[PDB]
Structure formats: structure tokens, C-alpha cells
Design a protein around this ligand. Structure first.
Ligand SMILES: O=C(c1cc2c(s1)CCCCC2)N1CCC(n2c(=O)[nH]c3ccccc32)CC1
Ligand SMILES: O=C(c1cc2c(s1)CCCCC2)N1CCC(n2c(=O)[nH]c3ccccc32)CC1
Lengths: 487, 150, 140
């Protein structure tokens, strides 16, 4: 079985390297995978299943996950063993409904700090075994992510119904205070948000250093997660520089000028800058950058749900189909970009000379041309984008024709992308989802605390293998005979 | 009363299975509704992510925006939902101040939201196509027999 | 046939409970359903069809509906018997077109209060048998 796994990996690498006889090597690798899956299928006792799943620590399951031997991992003989470790130290909870599991997740989300602080004695207690099961680790991580999203939403409170003061008006607690000090000073919730973000950063840095940069880059979703964490870090750094500037201004104003009210003071312009409202900030103000990066980071935070969906029985196949289609989504977006850039350059070249001669500034600049052509895809740009104020019907009609052809081409490319996705759409989906779920499980098999709380007489095996291989040889010969007993 | 009147016409579903031509149509509708629900859940997840992002970005520009679009949770939900069917304009992400960073980030996020909605719609259509496949005939006859025995 | 129906239901419940060997139990339940459908298919007389469709009140049809044995209920041998009760006390109306059935629905919609008040004597009349057929109940 080890020989077949290694040979399957070698043949897959050869299929990648050659590209001439790629089909031959892929067929051979499929032969090796089929042999491994059949040998596993022959098992009829726990001893044999264990001997297959780990040699003389699920070693062979991990190797099959590494080598993309999906039918071996998704086989029921392997899946039952994986569920045995998954639902360890908790037997009744395996048979509970999905609603009970969701209620358990909610309870863990509510009481995560209490169990975290009780973990100082939990290993000596019975509850330590309960929380150290892989399912409870997964539940704790999901509850941690839920709490992080809740913190992100709750930090935006008091603005759900809108702000009460206009951006032109400054409100300060006391006259001696600098307005930018009030706007940039940190409250408790975003301090917790920083602590959590540093927790995930520390974790991700741990796997990055353990696996190496080149190995870590090759996973697109991992670099997406790293980018999301780095965007959080950049936003908080910009906020910190804004706070430092504001507190320097506050120190200056409290040290030097001695007046009851700051309004009557004619402060120096460098110190006077930090008294203006939102409108009179610089375009490159550090707080503007902080807010802009924070919005993107908050949007990208919800993408971490992709680490939890594979565990679910119903949404796992949905994520599998999404992953199946994203590969041609990328290629057809590249084609969209090519066609879009062609038409954008054409429109800009046609209409660049009519900046003040057009009823609508639509294609007069590269920015404007990009904007109108992109928002024409979703129908948020009007047709008067190609109308002049001059009596040049040649230019206007050519713009009309080019814009209509652009719309038709976009529709055609969209339909072709849909059909390509349909073709790429086709129990391989079941084994794919089970492979993903098994990877998720083994990530938690051997991490006990969430990222925020992570800061603190040959042989028995030879006899079993010989028995299983004899069973395989006999079954193969019997199948061949039943195929050709008559001859 | 308006909602009750709208929902009253749903009782036609108790009569269509008796018909030979519309029974299979109701059968196909029931076949697809199961993944309709799951992909609406995915739509809700993506929508809530982008809604929170938009509101957090634009909450501080209540009087500084040409259009009150993402300045409240209600307004952000409204504009992002009606962007799906194309009843919201692109000027929803334009400020009255000279902060091109915020405005450009809003533009990018709104365009990415539209692209993601289209992608999720196409994936839902393909999932429905896959779920679409004389099993339909026996399914409709089973439904009609249940109607008869009632 | 009763044993196969009950075993099919039990195997479906096991398929739900396990989720590891769900495919095995689903295949076994399909085997039981196939056996029941074939035994029904062998019938070549009304007596045999009735004996299959209700044991020693369409009991087995109701059990198959409960257990989602869809090919047994949708089999023509069962469907003809179901149409027999469905179009009871009205034979010519079975062969009428869909437009005639729609016209009957419209007439019943127009005259529903009259037949409802006449139901006080309808069981003693011939029209009571007509309105008490399942098709007329559905139309009403
Ligand atoms: O519509 C947009 C969108 C960008 C993206 C969207 S949407 C989502 C999907 C496509 C990629 C990201 N934007 C942003 C920046 C635009 N923009 C300038 O501000 N200066 C420019 C100079 C050349 C080309 C474009 C210029 C203005 C409006
Ligand atoms: O919309 C259009 C478009 C043309 C085409 C588009 S779009 C792309 C795909 C369809 C074919 C090319 N145009 C151009 C010329 C139109 N046009 C006059 O200017 N005089 C006319 C007399 C009869 C019919 C049309 C007349 C005005 C606006």
C-alpha cells in the first residue's frame, strides 16, 4: 500500500512534467490509487483497518491526503476510524441533531472565557478531556470566529441608525481637548479586536515558519488569509500613527497655551490642523487610510467561514461546487479583462478630444472610460454616454456602435463562461466533500485553544498485510475467472 | 391583510398535482427549492459581509455623501439588496469631500459585491441544473396519488 | 411484501442514523423497494392486485406512501385501482377532456351553496353518491 501510494505520487509528478503522455501517467496513477482503495476495502476488522490506515498517528491517511488519494480517505472504512477520533471522549453527542450541535456552539461562544480560564486546572479535571477532543477544538475555533465577527459588528454600534453630528462639526468632552485625540483614542472593543488579530497573526506566522514561505505561498486561500490579517495590521498601524499625532498635538496644547477655552486660541498651524473636522482633513490623512483599510479587512473577515463549511454535511458540497467553478471563473475574468481593456482604450481614444464637448463626461479620461464600461456590465450607466454636444455624427455613431458591440460581447463572454462552468460541473462530489472534511478533521486531530487565547514470527503488521494481500489476490483472480470462466 | 392575500394564492399548490401537465412542473420546482434555500443562505452570508463593510466605510459621511446610501445599516441593506435587481444607482459611493481613498475603496467593494453576486447566482443555477438530474413521471404520480388518497 | 416494506423503512432510518455506510443501507432499501414493485408487477388479475394493494382500505398503498416507495404507488397496476376509486359513481366523466372538467369546476363554483344546502337530503338522493365521489370532493 505504501509502494502504491508513492508510485501514484511519482506518476502524477511525471504526468505534470511530461504533458505529452500525461494521460498515460494519469491512468497509471489512477491504477495505483484504485489498488490502494481496494486493499482498504477488503478490511473486515478494526485491526486490519488500523494496519492499513497507519503502517508499522494516521500515517497512511495523511499520505493519501498529501497525494490526493481521495477515494481512500473518503472510504467508509477510513471515515469510521476518523469519526472515532473526531468524536473522542464524547459519545452521546455524536448522535445528536445538527440543532443540538449549533446550541453547543452557541454555549461555547457564550462561555469561552470561562472555560479558557478554567483550562489552568482542566487537564487535572474531567472537562479537560472533553474540551481536548477534536470536535470541541473545532467548536471552540468556530465560536472564536463568531465572537470576532460579533466584535467587528458591535464596534460599529451607536452608528447603526447613523451618526448624530454632521462631519463639519467638532464635539469635544472638554475645551482643552484636541478633537483628533477624541476621534483617534482607542476604546476597549478595538483593543480586543487588536488582541484577536494579533492572535491570528501569531498563529499564521507559526505555520508560515514551520512550512516555509515558498510552500505556504502555493495555497491561494492561505495567502488570502495572510492578506486579510495584514490589512488589519496596516489599518491599526495607521490608526496608531493618527493617535500619536493627535496626542502630540494634545501634549503641545496643554503644555504651552493657558486659556479656559481652546476656541479663542490662535494655535500654530501644525497644531491647529488637529482641531479641524472631518471635512478639512487631508486626503492622505492616516485616519482616512485606517478606515479604508478597516472596511476591506472587515469584508474579508467573513471569508473565514470557508474553514467551517466543510464540516457541515449540507454546505460542504456547496463549497465543493464553488471551488470546482472558481478555476474557470478566473480564466473567463481574464478574458473579460482583455475585451474590457480593448474597448476601454478604443472608447477613450475616440472620446478623449471632447472633454467639454460631450453631454456627459463618460469616455473622456481613462478613469471615466473604465468607470462607465465597468458599470455598463450591471446596467448602472446610461446610454447618453456616447452623445456629443457637437454636430459630429460620425464620432457619435461610431461610439454608439462600439458601445453596443461591447455590451453584446460582454453578454456573449458571460454565456460562454456559464457554459464552461456547466461543463466543468461534470459520487465524485461526495468523495470530494468527504476528502475536504477529512482534511478539516485532521487539522484538529493534533490547537486546543483559539487563536486569541493562544498567546498565553515476522510481525503482527506483516501477518495482517500478508493476509490482506492474499485476500486481494484471491478476489482479483475470482473476478477474472467469473469474467472468463466459460472460456 | 396584504401579506395574507399574497400568501392565499400559494394554495394552488394543493391543486396542481392533480393536473397532468402542471404536476411535473411543480415536481421540478420542488426539486430545485432545496438548493435554492442553501444558495440563498450563501447569498445572505456574502450580502451581510459586504453590508457591514459598506456601513463601516460610509457611516461617518452621513452629511458628506451626495446620496444617503451606506450611512446606516438600514440604508446599506436597502441599497445592496436593490443593487441585485439593478434599482440602485452607482452614485451610491460618491462623497462630497475630497477623500478619494474612501470613495475608490467604496467603488471597488461595490463592484466586487456585484461580481460576487453574479458568481453566486451562476453557481446556484449550475447546482440547480445538476439537481435537475422516468423518475419525474413516478415522482409526479406519487404526488398525485397522495392528493387522491387525501 | 409487508416484510419488504417494513425492512425498507428500517434500512432508510439506518441510512439516516449512520451516515458512514449510508450508501449501503440506501442500496438495501432500494432492493426491498424493487422486490415490492416486482411482486406488484407480476399481478394479472384484479383479485391479485387487490391482495397486493391491501393485505388480509388501501393499506399497502398508504404504507408505501408513508415509506416513500414511489415506484410501487406509481405502477400502473396500482394507478388503475386508484383511478377506480377516484372516478367512483361517475364513469363517463373519466373519459371527458380537460376542458369539460374545467367547465364542471366552474359549474360547481357557481352552484356550491345550492348543492351544500341540498346535501341535507342528498344522501337519500342519487346526487349524494355523485358529490361523495373523491373527484367531486376535490372539485368542490
Ligand atoms: O469603478 C471602479 C472599480 C475598480 C474595481 C471595481 S470597480 C471592482 C472590479 C474591478 C477591479 C476593482 N473605480 C475605482 C477606481 C477608478 N479609477 C480612479 O479613481 N482613477 C483611475 C485611472 C485608470 C482606471 C480606473 C481609475 C474609479 C472608480
Ligand atoms: O444604436 C446604435 C447602434 C448601431 C449598432 C450597435 S448600436 C451595435 C450592434 C447593432 C449593430 C451596430 N446607433 C448607431 C446608428 C443609429 N442610426 C443613425 O444614426 N441613423 C439611423 C437610421 C436607421 C436605423 C439606425 C440609425 C443611431 C444609434
Amino acid at each position: 500500500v505504501l509502494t502504491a501510494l508513492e508510485l501514484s505520487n511519482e506518476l502524477a509528478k511525471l504526468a505534470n512534467i511530461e504533458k505529452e503522455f500525461k494521460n498515460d501517467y494519469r491512468k497509471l496513477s489512477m491504477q495505483c490509487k484504485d489498488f490502494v482503495v481496494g486493499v482498504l476495502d477488503l478490511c473486515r476488522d478494526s485491526e486490519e483497518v488500523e494496519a492499513i490506515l497507519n503502517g508499522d498517528s494516521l500515517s497512511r491517511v495523511k499520505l493519501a491526503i498529501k497525494y490526493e488519494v481521495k477515494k481512500f480517505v473518503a472510504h467508509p472504512n477510513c471515515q469510521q476510524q476518523l469519526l472515532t477520533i473526531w468524536y473522542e471522549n464524547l459519545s452521546g453527542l455524536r448522535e445528536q441533531t445538527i440543532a443540538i450541535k449549533c446550541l453547543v456552539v452557541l454555549v461555547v461562544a457564550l462561555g469561552l472565557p470561562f472555560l479558557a480560564i478554567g483550562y489552568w486546572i482542566a487537564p487535572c479535571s474531567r472537562l479537560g478531556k472533553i474540551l481536548r477532543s477534536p470536535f470541541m477544538k473545532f467548536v471552540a475555533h468556530a465560536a472564536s470566529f463568531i465572537i470576532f465577527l460579533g466584535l467587528l459588528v458591535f464596534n460599529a454600534s451607536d452608528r447603526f441608525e447613523g451618526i448624530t453630528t454632521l462631519p463639519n462639526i467638532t464635539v469635544t468632552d472638554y475645551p482643552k481637548q484636541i478633537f483628533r485625540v477624541k476621534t483617534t483614542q482607542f476604546t476597549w472593543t478595538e483593543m480586543l479586536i487588536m488582541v484577536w488579530v494579533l492572535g491570528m497573526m501569531w498563529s499564521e506566522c507559526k505555520e508560515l515558519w514551520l512550512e516555509g514561505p515558498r510552500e505556504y505561498i502555493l495555497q491561494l486561500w492561505n495567502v488570502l488569509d495572510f492578506g486579510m490579517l495584514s490589512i488589519f495590521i496596516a489599518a491599526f498601524t495607521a490608526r496608531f500613527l493618527a493617535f500619536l499625532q493627535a496626542t502630540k498635538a494634545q501634549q503641545y496644547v496643554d503644555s504651552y497655551v493657558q486659556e479656559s477655552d481652546l476656541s479663542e486660541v490662535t494655535l500654530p498651524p501644525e497644531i491647529q490642523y488637529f482641531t479641524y473636522a472631518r471635512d478639512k482633513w487631508l486626503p492622505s490623512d492616516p485616519q482616512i487610510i485606517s478606515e479604508g483599510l478597516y472596511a476591506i479587512a472587515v469584508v474579508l473577515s467573513f471569508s473565514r467561514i470557508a474553514y467551517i463549511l466543510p464540516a457541515n454535511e449540507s454546505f460542504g458540497p456547496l463549497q465543493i461546487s464553488l471551488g470546482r467553478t472558481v478555476k474557470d471563473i478566473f480564466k473567463f475574468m481574464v478574458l473579460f479583462i482583455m475585451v474590457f481593456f480593448a474597448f476601454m482604450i478604443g472608447m477613450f481614444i475616440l472620446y478623449s478630444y471632447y472633454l467639454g464637448a460631450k453631454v456627459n463626461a463618460a469616455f473622456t479620461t481613462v478613469e471615466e472610460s473604465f468607470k462607465t464600461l465597468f458599470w455598463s456590465i450591471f446596467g448602472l450607466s446610461e446610454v447618453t454616454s456616447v452623445v456629443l454636444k457637437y454636430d459630429h455624427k460620425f464620432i457619435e455613431n461610431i461610439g454608439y456602435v462600439l458601445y453596443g458591440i461591447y455590451n453584446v460581447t460582454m453578454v456573449v463572454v458571460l454565456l460562454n463562461m456559464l457554459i464552461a462552468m456547466i461543463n466543468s460541473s461534470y459520487d465524485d462530489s461526495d468523495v470530494e466533500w468527504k476528502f475536504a472534511r477529512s482534511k478539516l478533521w485532521l487539522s484538529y486531530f493534533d490547537k486546543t485553544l483559539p487563536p486569541p487565547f493562544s498567546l498565553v514470527q515476522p510481525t503482527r503488521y506483516q501477518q495482517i498485510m500478508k493476509r490482506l494481500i492474499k485476500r486481494y489476490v484471491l478476489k482479483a483472480q475470482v473476478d477474472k475467472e467469473n469474467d472468463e470462466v466459460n472460456e
